Amino acid sequence: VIKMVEVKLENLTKRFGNFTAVNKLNLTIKDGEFLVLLGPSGCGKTTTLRMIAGLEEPTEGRIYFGDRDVTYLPPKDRNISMVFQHMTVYENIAFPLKKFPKDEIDKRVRWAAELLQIEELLNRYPAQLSGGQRQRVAVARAIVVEPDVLLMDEPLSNLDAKLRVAMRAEIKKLQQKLKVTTIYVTHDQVEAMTMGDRIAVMNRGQLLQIGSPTEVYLRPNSVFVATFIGAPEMNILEVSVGDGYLEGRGFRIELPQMDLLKDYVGKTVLFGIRPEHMTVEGVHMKRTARLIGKVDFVEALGTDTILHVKFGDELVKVKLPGHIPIEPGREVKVIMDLDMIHVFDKDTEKAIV
């Protein structure tokens, strides 16, 4: 019966020669939670997963599973199970069971198979699996060992959108049930928001932020994070903090007394507002800000209508629900939800919000 093991990553560093793949990573994965390591290629997420698995040792640092320092133990002694990417399903799931009693194997395979709802496909073969999913079999074999830490690396990279989504839900629910500490690696910001109880955004080997999808989405602490989750991406416009307003390359926004930019008056900061936190008059937000402009391009995707409006010299994207194929050239009155606005220091790109 699966346990809820807390995992600690202390001052973890990994560098191949001169290149630092992971720089002083300090992270505490809460026992039984589903943590996701989101980030672009080369950010260090995969190298961090491998070190946790034991397939790769740290250049410096320590790794804990519960109170045990597992930093220097073989991947086999860490009670873990990796999940990436001629026999029968039963055999496929029993495989990982490695000096194991048959009487025990049958109980585990029945257990796993039932959790992945594939008990009925047990006596079938791979290419024959037309009554289920070879995917679900892969997971069952993953949990059949009853690991303390479940590790996954872009497990749904090659799946048709529709199916993939189904697996996101399949996996998340299973984990919510087993309550097994899971660390999930992926570059897909949508998939991260769907599965992680908390998400750890990475870049250039560093941990930029960690928290619930709600926190990293509504309150990102920097430009990178603010733009890596949520698409269309958040609009970032360069501006100058005047009195109680902001001036852009051809526009201004009245800043209600907010104005936590008192230390940036006369200086330049980064304005931020998501396409979904804007709209157009003639289509309720407590406080708002207006700016008129002409539509430069429209993305009538049927289920959404993304507009490319020209704010002075700048160009931003506005997201409207449904199919609203307005035509380019026409002028619209953009309405900004002042409560969803963000402001980042231009140098440290750190939020000031």
Next chain:
Amino acid sequence: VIKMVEVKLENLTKRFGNFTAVNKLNLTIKDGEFLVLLGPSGCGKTTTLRMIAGLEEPTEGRIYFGDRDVTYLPPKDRNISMVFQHMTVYENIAFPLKKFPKDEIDKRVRWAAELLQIEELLNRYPAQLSGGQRQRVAVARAIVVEPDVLLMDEPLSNLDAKLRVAMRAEIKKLQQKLKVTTIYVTHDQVEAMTMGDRIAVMNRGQLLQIGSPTEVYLRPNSVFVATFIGAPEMNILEVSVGDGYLEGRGFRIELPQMDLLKDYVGKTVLFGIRPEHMTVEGVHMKRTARLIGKVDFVEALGTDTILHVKFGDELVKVKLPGHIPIEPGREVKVIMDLDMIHVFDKDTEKAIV
């Protein structure tokens, strides 16, 4: 100066041995329009593009460019330019100019470069192109020839989301300007809805439907099309046409006097309603239909909240704008926009709407 050439595909068939890649395709691409051939892998879209280019001959059929039968002419005599996937930009774009006068080349390169807004990168090299996009150079070289028919095959397959979108707009506007007949191939339904003036949905070598993004989206003539454009996919539930209502595996929907199913009373048809055409009480549609159910899973993507609600034995997806992380288990009252409902015959999967 580019011309507006109408392209006709008459009873086009292409079969490698016993396999039919394209079955009796009849299509009329309107001069100067941007037509998109959307469809999954193996549908025949690419083989149709190649036959148009002349790189591949038909097994039967005829192809017209204007009043000229170009079916059996070398790709070079068809005045076309393909676009798929050490020199200087100027050189790169001049390359296609193949017995050409320099005095003429300079005018064309200047022309193209200006249209792709890359005149300032002309004396630069590929890997050095840090001030623009090697992508824009590719297109400029494509139009530099001044083709009658512009052909493109998944040109943006390997581009980071953000960039890709920029190219969709870049390309579409350029074409809207040049008014050159363009046939665009892609499996991306979103990209299709963004660029095609009309879209031709294909599958198993057949043309299922053609029309504006608005038409194929709001009024698809079959299950396939109705589910291939718009994601999350349209919900399809099997039902029986009673009096003025529909009965599902655990639910019913009052059908206002609609009811064009008079010939399906007592029979079974396919109910259809998109996730974006539904909602939840407590969050205006002229006519509606209700059904209560419990949330099975939630996709809080920040910019959208996709719910997986259990309608009786069936499970459907509802799309709500914004971040509304409701919790699983809770029961919601789903509201269906009766005006966005579709009904397809269960056998021919052809719409009855």
